[PDB]
Amino acid sequence: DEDIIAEENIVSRSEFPESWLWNVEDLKEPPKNGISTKLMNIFLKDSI
Amino acid sequence: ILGGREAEAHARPYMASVQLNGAHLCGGVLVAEQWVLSAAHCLEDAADGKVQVLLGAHSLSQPEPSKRLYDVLRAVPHPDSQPDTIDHDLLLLQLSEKATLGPAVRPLPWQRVDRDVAPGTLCDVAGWGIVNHAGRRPDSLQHVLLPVLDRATCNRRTHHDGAITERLMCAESNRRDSCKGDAGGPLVCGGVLEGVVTSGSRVCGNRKKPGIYTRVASYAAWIDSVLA
Amino acid sequence: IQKDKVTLEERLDKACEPGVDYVYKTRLVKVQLSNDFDEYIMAIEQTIKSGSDEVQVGQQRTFISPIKCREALKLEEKKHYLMWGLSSDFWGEKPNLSYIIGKDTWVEHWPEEDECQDEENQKQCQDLGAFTESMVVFGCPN
Amino acid sequence: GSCSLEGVEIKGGSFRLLQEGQALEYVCPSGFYPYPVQTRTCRSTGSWSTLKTQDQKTVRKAECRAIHCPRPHDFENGEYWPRSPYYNVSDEISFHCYDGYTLRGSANRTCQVNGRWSGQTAICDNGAGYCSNPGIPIGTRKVGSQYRLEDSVTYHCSRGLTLRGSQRRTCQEGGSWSGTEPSCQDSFMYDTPQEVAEAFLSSLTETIEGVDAEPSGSMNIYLVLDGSGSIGASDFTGAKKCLVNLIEKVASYGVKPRYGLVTYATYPKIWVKVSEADSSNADWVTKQLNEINYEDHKLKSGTNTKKALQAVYSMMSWPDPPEGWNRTRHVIILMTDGLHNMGGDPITVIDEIRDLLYIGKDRKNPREDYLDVYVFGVGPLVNQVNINALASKKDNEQHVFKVKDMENLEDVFYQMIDESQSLSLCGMVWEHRKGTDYHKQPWQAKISVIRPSKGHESCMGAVVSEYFVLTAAHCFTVDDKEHSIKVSVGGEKRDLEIEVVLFHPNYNINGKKEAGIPEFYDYDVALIKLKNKLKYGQTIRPICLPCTEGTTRALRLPPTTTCQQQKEELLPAQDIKALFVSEEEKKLTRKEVYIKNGDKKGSCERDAQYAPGYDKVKDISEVVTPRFLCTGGVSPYADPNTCRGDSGGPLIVHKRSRFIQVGVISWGVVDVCKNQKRQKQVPAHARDFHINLFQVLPWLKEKLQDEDLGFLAA
Numbered sequence A: 001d002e003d004i005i006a007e008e009n010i011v012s013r014s015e016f017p018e019s020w021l022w023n024v025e026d027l028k029e030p031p032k033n034g035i036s037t038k039l040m041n042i043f044l045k046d047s048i
Numbered sequence B: 001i002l003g004g005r006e007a008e009a010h011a012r013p014y015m016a017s018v019q020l021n022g023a024h025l026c027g028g029v030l031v032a033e034q035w036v037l038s039a040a041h042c043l044e045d046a047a048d049g050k051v052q053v054l055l056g057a058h059s060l061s062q063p064e065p066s067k068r069l070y071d072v073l074r075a076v077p078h079p080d081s082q083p084d085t086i087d088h089d090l091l092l093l094q095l096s097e098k099a100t101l102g103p104a105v106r107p108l109p110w111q112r113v114d115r116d117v118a119p120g121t122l123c124d125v126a127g128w129g130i131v132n133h134a135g136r137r138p139d140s141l142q143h144v145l146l147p148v149l150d151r152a153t154c155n156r157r158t159h160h161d162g163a164i165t166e167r168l169m170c171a172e173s174n175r176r177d178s179c180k181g182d183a184g185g186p187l188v189c190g191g192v193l194e195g196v197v198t199s200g201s202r203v204c205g206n207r208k209k210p211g212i213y214t215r216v217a218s219y220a221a222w223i224d225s226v227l228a
Numbered sequence C: 001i002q003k004d005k006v007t008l009e010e011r012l013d014k015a016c017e018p019g020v021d022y023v024y025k026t027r028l029v030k031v032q033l034s035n036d037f038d039e040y041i042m043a044i045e046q047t048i049k050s051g052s053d054e055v056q057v058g059q060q061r062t063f064i065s066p067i068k069c070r071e072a073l074k075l076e077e078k079k080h081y082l083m084w085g086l087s088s089d090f091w092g093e094k095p096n097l098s099y100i101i102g103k104d105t106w107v108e109h110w111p112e113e114d115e116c117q118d119e120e121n122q123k124q125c126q127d128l129g130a131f132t133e134s135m136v137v138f139g140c141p142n
Numbered sequence D: 001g002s003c004s005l006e007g008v009e010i011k012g013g014s015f016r017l018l019q020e021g022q023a024l025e026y027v028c029p030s031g032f033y034p035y036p037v038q039t040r041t042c043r044s045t046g047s048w049s050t051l052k053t054q055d056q057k058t059v060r061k062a063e064c065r066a067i068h069c070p071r072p073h074d075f076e077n078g079e080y081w082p083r084s085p086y087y088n089v090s091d092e093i094s095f096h097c098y099d100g101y102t103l104r105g106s107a108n109r110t111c112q113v114n115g116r117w118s119g120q121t122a123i124c125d126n127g128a129g130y131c132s133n134p135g136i137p138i139g140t141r142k143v144g145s146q147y148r149l150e151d152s153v154t155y156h157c158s159r160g161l162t163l164r165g166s167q168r169r170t171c172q173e174g175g176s177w178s179g180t181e182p183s184c185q186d187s188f189m190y191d192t193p194q195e196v197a198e199a200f201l202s203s204l205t206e207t208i209e210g211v212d213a214e215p216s217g218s219m220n221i222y223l224v225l226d227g228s229g230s231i232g233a234s235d236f237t238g239a240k241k242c243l244v245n246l247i248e249k250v251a252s253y254g255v256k257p258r259y260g261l262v263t264y265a266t267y268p269k270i271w272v273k274v275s276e277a278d279s280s281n282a283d284w285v286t287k288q289l290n291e292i293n294y295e296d297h298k299l300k301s302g303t304n305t306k307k308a309l310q311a312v313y314s315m316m317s318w319p320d321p322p323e324g325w326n327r328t329r330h331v332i333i334l335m336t337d338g339l340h341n342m343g344g345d346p347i348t349v350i351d352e353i354r355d356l357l358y359i360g361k362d363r364k365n366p367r368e369d370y371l372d373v374y375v376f377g378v379g380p381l382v383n384q385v386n387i388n389a390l391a392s393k394k395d396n397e398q399h400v401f402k403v404k405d406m407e408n409l410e411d412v413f414y415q416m417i418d419e420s421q422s423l424s425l426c427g428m429v430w431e432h433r434k435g436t437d438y439h440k441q442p443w444q445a446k447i448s449v450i451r452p453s454k455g456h457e458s459c460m461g462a463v464v465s466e467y468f469v470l471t472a473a474h475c476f477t478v479d480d481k482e483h484s485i486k487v488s489v490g491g492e493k494r495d496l497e498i499e500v501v502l503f504h505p506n507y508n509i510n511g512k513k514e515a516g517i518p519e520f521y522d523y524d525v526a527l528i529k530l531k532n533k534l535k536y537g538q539t540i541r542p543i544c545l546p547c548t549e550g551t552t553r554a555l556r557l558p559p560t561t562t563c564q565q566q567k568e569e570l571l572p573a574q575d576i577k578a579l580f581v582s583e584e585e586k587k588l589t590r591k592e593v594y595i596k597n598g599d600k601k602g603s604c605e606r607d608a609q610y611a612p613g614y615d616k617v618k619d620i621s622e623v624v625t626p627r628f629l630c631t632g633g634v635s636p637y638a639d640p641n642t643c644r645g646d647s648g649g650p651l652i653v654h655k656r657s658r659f660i661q662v663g664v665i666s667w668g669v670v671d672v673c674k675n676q677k678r679q680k681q682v683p684a685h686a687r688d689f690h691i692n693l694f695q696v697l698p699w700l701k702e703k704l705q706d707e708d709l710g711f712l713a714a
């Protein structure tokens, strides 16, 4: 009606994988205490 | 004549228009008072037709006081001219009478000294041949100055691959070239006729395949002969 | 489509819309109520705008429309109607096509000859009459 | 009368009246676009045209909205970052594939100002199917994961977007999806004049190089111009001028096709008919193209495209079996806005035409290469849905174009005229009636060598140019002189005299005797420069080589295609379907094989240990250098094995009616050939190795520099 968001400006979810993040990572960072550490920035799916 | 210009009216009295059945066929040049030099291959498609020569003309359609259509009294193609090759592609046409000399009609001096033209020399070539790949037939005479490429380079494999005899000469064709309908045209290298347009068929403007012209100087013997 | 004066220029643009395919002046010959699909058998009197269906005058074409709309159509046999529809309203394989009267199909009662003498139809028979020739001779503008 | 300008303005922008106020065009600031429509017409009701969207929806107020590039709403076998509800201009998104999957196509893509993503579509494939993964063009959605033979896929575009190309593609025999790659179009994407001219010609010239086989006059070009009042004199005259330069551009190739000129409105108007004695006269057709005017169809400004295509139909039809019908290529080019309102669906005619030319009416003989349809959007308002439904859908080719400014195409065509560029002729094979061997493999060369009682060496090669013959390097030795080496091509009885045999600088067959390796076929390639120039005939033709301008056109790729891109095309990361020519009882016959370039590559290479002599090789990779392609075996199929006499022969990849050599038959593991028959009991490890041409390019490009093959820098 007068308020709320337009039923057109609504970007619906769609990506609902049962599995993902099937990638590989190598730990070449500066080793401290024999414990290398990487910080991955991944994107979560639309699934709840 | 690709990338040519509209020549000035009757600025080239020697320029002739060999016509088959009242229609332009090949280019010609008035070498004598009653003789027209041209390409021999022009009479290969003739046979059943009425060959003529239009002198002192600029426009093939519009009426001009200096225009006059002569009749061919005799056609003498060089004895060693085959339809298969370009070698010895010369033709001498005798008019029915001496051409009425005037401000628009005059014979042209042709080279006798059999020495190659200095590479880089600017030569003028004219004709009524098409001006575009579509095949547009010009009404007025066209012309263009072309640098003379040395036979050394013209014979490179990348070009004509040694198919250029000592009796033939080359001229740059980088988008500017004598196309179809210019066959038999005059190649004047400084007030003097040095070559005659003759390259059979190609694709006008192909820089990788320079234009081929028959050196009149290397045929002086035969020419003098005929005019006797 | 719809049902507030629908002038001449109104009919011209509406009948020349990209969607509109056919435009006929038909006569409702027979009306049927058969199981799944309801049937209106029309007889094309003249093809105002030849559509993608090669049909000549005198032939018959069957039209289909749901019952819920039958009350609104109130079509009566032997009566003539000016109707045009979309190319997306065809049904079946040729030459057995069947026009479908959908929410985008224009239908209008065509007052017969002797009825165009009425001081209530004279204003309509002139619009339709003008619409016909304009669409036949010149055809759709643009 | 002139429609009122009340409530016509647009929020965040202005407008400009055109065609003397009969139409308006919204003017939006840099980075924004008019919504919903670009322009508006003045109806005969005093009011402007209704604001219709792409989904045929109605909008009250016009708004200038930011330009966004279609957001990926479907992607498989990998991930893409970052994900956003929408992407602005200059926004970048990159793609990555899961493990075990190879990535082909642009890894990083940027949202450009034309509302399109830069680079090519990203595709994550595993190369495990008969056909490769068609991929999912950004903005679309693919339905179909099975890529077997006969299998299919379907594409759908987001709401508000129009699908260009094929909506369904079927995996055809010979590893190649039907139709063309889809693409989600919006209502402002257009096409730059160069892009159009570049793609329109890269698809036309090719279907002309083949026409040279060989008045006249063996191709027809039907020019159907739309003279409806819905185009305006502006976008109409600009369409003629574009055609004029196109005729000249074609003429510059020295080819004389038969033309058919037709302008249409309420009725079709024929100016030139292909049956006319002057149809092939380019100048003739051009004079007509000039005489026609936009005022020709003002009295009856209808838009009956159906009848227009019916005009073309009657031109290609017959009174009822001309001798030359199944050998003629038909090309239809029509400018229109796609807004037809009379006659109905024009597509019905296209189908009738295809029935007339016997196209798509034979499983074994599609005959698709005999009909091309190009559609140019010209009018202010153009229906991309309808012009896409008429235009042809051929793999890697574009037939639908929406000219932006137009008129510029004319100036681009004129600039693209170059008499210096030659017309290709490599990899050409046409179904001639007699079809004597060497007509089916003109490039095939038969090499022989005579030695003092030692015997005769029997190898094969391919004609790559007018002077050279590419073959294997082990067929000859430093001792063998030119007089003892005879080459024969075209099946000619006589033998050609050679000038010199050029071996590859790195060819050393004995450079492994210390490691205990008798044979070392690394860089096993050589060229044979003939003493005489070859006259290309019906039996003698060249074969296309990798990384050449001539090959690019064969694959129908943009001229700006780099060498690396060609390798990804010809030799993808999978089981590539190829073939080679073998000698079968003094008769040439083809043998279809599979190049194990996928994951089976390892299984194929190591089998080299079974080869004679290699039995004690420590590291098998020491005898199989990266210069080798591997074929033969049992997986995924039972491939035929090369014979001794086939050695040196071309490893050919038949794609899109063109043959491309990608290797040279070097050596095999097991000798199944034994001049008596073919060892009916071939082992599973009977593999065959070849030389990857993409590995000896420096040597090829150098030695063939004066052959006008136009190799690519890279």
Ligand SMILES: *[C@@H]1O[C@H](CO)[C@@H](O[C@@H]2O[C@H](CO)[C@@H](O[C@@H]3O[C@H](CO)[C@@H](O)[C@H](O)[C@@H]3O)[C@H](O)[C@H]2NC(C)=O)[C@H](O)[C@H]1NC(C)=O
Residues within 6 Å of the ligand: D094, D107, D108
């Ligand atoms: C897609 O985008 C990424 C991000 O640029 C590309 O990876 C990048 O590769 C380049 C070239 O090696 C690296 O550039 C580096 O820039 C830093 C800036 O200080 C400089 O110090 C380095 O010398 C180097 O020039 C960049 O580090 C690297 N990005 C990473 C690893 O995060 C990638 O190539 C692109 N994919 C394509 C287009 O194939």
Ligand SMILES: *[C@@H]1O[C@H](CO)[C@@H](O)[C@H](O)[C@H]1NC(C)=O
Residues within 6 Å of the ligand: D066, D088
């Ligand atoms: C993209 O640009 C629009 C218009 O300026 C802006 O409203 C929007 O916030 C931007 N998108 C992002 C990065 O959120």
Ligand SMILES: *[C@@H]1O[C@H](CO)[C@@H](O)[C@H](O)[C@H]1NC(C)=O
Residues within 6 Å of the ligand: D326, D327, D365, D431, D433
């Ligand atoms: C006509 O052309 C086709 C091309 O596929 C060919 O197969 C056929 O043999 C030709 N017809 C005749 C009578 O040879």
Ligand SMILES: [Mg+2]
Residues within 6 Å of the ligand: C142, D228, D229, D230, D231, D301, D302, D303, D339, D340
């Ligand atoms: Mg129109």
